[PDB]
Structure formats: structure tokens, C-alpha cells
Amino acid sequence: TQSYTNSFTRGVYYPDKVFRSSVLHSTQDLFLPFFSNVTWFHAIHVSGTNGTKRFDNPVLPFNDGVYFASTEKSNIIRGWIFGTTLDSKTQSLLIVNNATNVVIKVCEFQFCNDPFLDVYYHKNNKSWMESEFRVYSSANNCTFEYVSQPFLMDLEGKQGNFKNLREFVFKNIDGYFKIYSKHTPINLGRDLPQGFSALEPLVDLPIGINITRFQTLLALHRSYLTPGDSSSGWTAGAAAYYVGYLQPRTFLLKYNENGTITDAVDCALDPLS
Amino acid sequence: NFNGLTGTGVLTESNKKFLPFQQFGRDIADTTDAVRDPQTLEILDITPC
Amino acid sequence: KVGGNYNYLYRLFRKSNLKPFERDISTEIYQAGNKPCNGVAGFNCYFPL
Ligand SMILES: *[C@@H]1O[C@H](CO)[C@@H](O)[C@H](O)[C@H]1NC(C)=O
Ligand SMILES: *[C@@H]1O[C@H](CO)[C@@H](O)[C@H](O)[C@H]1NC(C)=O
Ligand SMILES: *[C@@H]1O[C@H](CO)[C@@H](O)[C@H](O)[C@H]1NC(C)=O
Ligand SMILES: *[C@@H]1O[C@H](CO)[C@@H](O)[C@H](O)[C@H]1NC(C)=O
Ligand SMILES: *[C@@H]1O[C@H](CO)[C@@H](O)[C@H](O)[C@H]1NC(C)=O
Numbered sequence: 001t002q003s004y005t006n007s008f009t010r011g012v013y014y015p016d017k018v019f020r021s022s023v024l025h026s027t028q029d030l031f032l033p034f035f036s037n038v039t040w041f042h043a044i045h046v047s048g049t050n051g052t053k054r055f056d057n058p059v060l061p062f063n064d065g066v067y068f069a070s071t072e073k074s075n076i077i078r079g080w081i082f083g084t085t086l087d088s089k090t091q092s093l094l095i096v097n098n099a100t101n102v103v104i105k106v107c108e109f110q111f112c113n114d115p116f117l118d119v120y121y122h123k124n125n126k127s128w129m130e131s132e133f134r135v136y137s138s139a140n141n142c143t144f145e146y147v148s149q150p151f152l153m154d155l156e157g158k159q160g161n162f163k164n165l166r167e168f169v170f171k172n173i174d175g176y177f178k179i180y181s182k183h184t185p186i187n188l189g190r191d192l193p194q195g196f197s198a199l200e201p202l203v204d205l206p207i208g209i210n211i212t213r214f215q216t217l218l219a220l221h222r223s224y225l226t227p228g229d230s231s232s233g234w235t236a237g238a239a240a241y242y243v244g245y246l247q248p249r250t251f252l253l254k255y256n257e258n259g260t261i262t263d264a265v266d267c268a269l270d271p272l273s
Numbered sequence: 274n275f276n277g278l279t280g281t282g283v284l285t286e287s288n289k290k291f292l293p294f295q296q297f298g299r300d301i302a303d304t305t306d307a308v309r310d311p312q313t314l315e316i317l318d319i320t321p322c
Numbered sequence: 323k324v325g326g327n328y329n330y331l332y333r334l335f336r337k338s339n340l341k342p343f344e345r346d347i348s349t350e351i352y353q354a355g356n357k358p359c360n361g362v363a364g365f366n367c368y369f370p371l
């Protein structure tokens with residue numbers, strides 16, 4: 001279960017921490033190229049009576065930072081795990097987002113078997129979900145605990161047709177792990193809206209390890225509204241779980257009179273650009 | 274002398290909408306024009322003599 | 323010490339140069355020959371530390 005789509009003008013953030021207004025700034029950094037293609041991975045739960053395997057948590061290359069977008073009203077997505085081997089021989093991050101906290105632990109966790117999963121996995125009759133996640137086993141030699149405020153909140157969705165698109169970008173430069181984020185309340189029917197909404201800086205950490213793989217700690221205990229298909233290659237579907245890769249591009253940003261970013265032009269897409 | 278960045282000029286109350294992660298303000302030619310007070314969360318505008 | 327100090331270790335063999343401010347603490351036998359370095363120790367298989 002995987003498809004493709006087009007990311008029109010999404011994935012732009014503030015390069016630095018200096019206020020600017022009514023001016024055009026030319027910058028060069030790791031950005032998401034305009035009109036690039038982004039994959040769709042869908043988490044499908046099949047035959048809740050039975051226990052059919054899902055394979056809903058693929059491992060992705062993480063080549064020079066990644067862009068992430070999710071459109072879910074619930075808190076089904078909970079954290080992302082990074083690392084080069086995800087074994088006991090190497091050190092792996094454990095960014096985990098529970099109800100009101102974020103625990104970041106860089107360590108050499110022995111194993112990450114799987115999230116807890118009920119055999120029925122049915123949420124049409126039951127709704128409560130209490131303390132049913134435990135992924136690791138041991139932690140021998142490590143530091144850098146960062147218990148802090150939750151990164152992603154939950155905006156209220158009312159009257160239907162109102163969902164919040166959550167966008168994140170993670171990068172690693174000279175042993176520093178940078179995370180930017182933005183939660184756009186307005187997407188409506190369009191799967192990936194076309195427009196501009198800059199990402200504000202969120203967190204910078206001194207991790208200092210190599211990262212060549214990552215995946216998600218998706219709580220596969222239950223999941224609704226997850227249609228399935230056998231499509232592959234250049235096809236279409238529905239996933240509500242996006243991902244894309246950054247490249248070292250040069251952009252030209254236009255700053256509004258109020259200090260916000262209104263428009264941007266890529267300097268490597270077309271001859272006219 | 275705001276947090277180690279010296280200068281010279283008159284300071285006035287400013288009406289620029291900063292952001293929580295933004296402290297300094299610049300312009301063309303890359304010179305400081307607006308500063309955020311360290312002790313109190315206030316925005317000041319610098320004008321030369 | 324007069325007898326000798328052995329509590330200080332340093333790595334000599336590894337696949338590639340490490341990026342700035344990055345630390346490697348893995349203790350695995352380096353593949354320094356055509357022989358598959360699956361064993362604990364042997365010729366063409368060096369302890370990096
Ligand atoms: C990228 O995605 C598009 C669909 O939007 C597809 O046609 C193309 O083959 C993909 N790969 C590229 C452009 O390398
Ligand atoms: C989230 O985790 C933190 C630390 O692990 C804990 O203190 C907090 O109580 C947790 N949240 C809830 C709602 O239990
Ligand atoms: C943790 O430290 C001990 C003692 O220094 C060492 O024996 C052990 O191998 C270390 N853990 C890992 C995963 O290397
Ligand atoms: C800047 O903010 C003011 C304050 O409400 C608003 O009236 C004005 O429309 C904003 N400017 C732009 C270009 O949106
Ligand atoms: C000390 O610094 C804090 C920073 O926010 C400020 O709120 C407070 O008023 C300062 N105290 C005095 C006595 O100036």
C-alpha cells in the first residue's frame with residue numbers, strides 16, 4: 001500500500017531568527033523542491049476478527065533531513081524513532097509524544113519489537129485507550145533526557161470538513177538535530193493544499209550521532225477510516241501519512257510588511273524561475 | 274548595550290510585530306534597527322543621531 | 323603509573339572519517355582483509371581500540 005502525489009508549494013520555513021519586512025531575501029539551504037513528488041504510506045488494519053499482518057511501519061532512508069505531513073483528527077501518530085541500525089550496537093533516538101509530554105532519549109536501546117496490539121483491534125464499540133505502549137527493553141550507557149512540553153497539540157475539529165494538517169521537518173547538521181513545525185488548521189477537502197504557510201523553528205538539540213534510518217512509533221492498537229489497496233508505483237490512493245526528502249536548494253523569499261513570508265520562488269526549477 | 278551588541282542612537286517605542294523566537298530586527302545593508310529589551314519583553318526602535 | 327596505565331583507549335581502524343562533533347563507541351572487529359571477519363579475532367581482523 002503506497003502511492004504518490006505532488007507537493008505544490010509546501011515545506012518552507014524561516015531560515016534564521018531575524019525580523020525582516022517588505023524585502024526580498026535570497027537564501028541557500030536544505031529545502032523541499034517545488035512540485036516534487038511525495039509518497040503515501042497507509043496503515044491498513046485488515047480482518048479485525050483475525051490477526052493478519054499489516055506491515056504498516058516501513059523504515060525510510062532519511063537522506064539529509066525529511067519533511068513530514070499528517071492529516072488526522074486523533075492522536076494516532078505518536079513520535080518518530082531514528083537511528084542507523086535500531087539495535088543494541090548503535091545509538092538511537094526515541095522521540096515519543098504522549099498526552100502532555102515529550103521524552104527524548106538518545107541511547108542504544110537493545111530492541112524495538114512492536115507496539116502493543118489487541119487481537120480484535122476494534123474501536124467502533126470501545127473508545128478508551130489507556131497506557132498500552134512499551135517498545136524498548138534496556139538502556140545501558142546514555143544521557144540527554146529532554147522531558148519537556150508536547151510538540152504537537154490537538155486543535156478542536158467541529159461541524160466536520162475541518163481538519164488540521166500537521167507539518168514537520170527534521171534535519172541533522174554537524175551533530176545538531178533541528179526540528180521545525182507548523183499546524184495549519186485549514187485544509188478542507190484537498191488532500192495536500194496548494195499555497196504558502198511558513199514553518200516556525202521548534203527545537204535544536206546537541207545529539208551528535210549519525211542517522212541513516214527512521215520510522216514511526218504508530219500506535220497500531222486500533223485504526224479506523226483506513227481503506228486498503230494493492231496499488232504500487234505511480235498510482236493514487238489515500239494515506240494521511242506523508243513523507244518527502246530535502247535537497248540543498250537556493251530560494252528567494254518575499255517578506256510581507258507585517259514580517260511574514262508571503263511568496264517564494266525556487267531558483268533551480270525552470271529557466272524562467 | 275543590549276546583550277553585548279553596542280551602538281549609538283536614540284531609542285523609541287516601536288510598533289513592529291515580532292515573534293517569540295525573534296529578538297533582533299535588521300534591514301538592507303545588515304544593520305540593527307529594532308531590539309527586544311532583555312529585562313522586559315518590549316520592542317524598541319533605534320534611530321541614528 | 324610506573325607499571326603502566328591502560329584505562330585510556332583510542333580508535334585506530336574504522337570504515338570512514340567521522341563528521342564533526344560525532345562520536346562512535348561501537349566495539350566490533352574491523353574487516354581488514356579478504357577473510358570474512360566473522361570470528362572474534364584473527365589475522366586480517368583487527369580490534370579497532
Ligand atoms: C514523481 O512523481 C510524479 C507524479 O507526480 C511521477 O510522474 C514521476 O515519475 C515521479 N518521479 C520523478 C519525477 O522522478
Ligand atoms: C507523559 O509522560 C511523562 C513522562 O514520561 C509523564 O510524566 C506524564 O504523566 C505522561 N502523561 C500522562 C497523561 O500520563
Ligand atoms: C556500556 O559500558 C560498559 C562499560 O564501559 C561496556 O562494557 C558496554 O559494552 C557498554 N555498552 C555498549 C552497548 O557498548
Ligand atoms: C498586518 O496586521 C494588521 C493588524 O491587524 C492587519 O490589519 C494587516 O492587514 C496586516 N497586513 C497584511 C499584509 O496582512
Ligand atoms: C527579571 O527578568 C524577568 C525576565 O522576564 C522579568 O520579567 C522581571 O521583571 C525581572 N525582574 C526585575 C526586578 O527587573
Ligand SMILES: *[C@@H]1O[C@H](CO)[C@@H](O)[C@H](O)[C@H]1NC(C)=O
Pocket residue numbers: 084210211212338339340341344
Ligand atoms: C555513521 O557516521 C559516519 C560519519 O561520517 C557516516 O559516514 C556513516 O554513514 C554513518 N553510518 C554508518 C552505518 O556508519
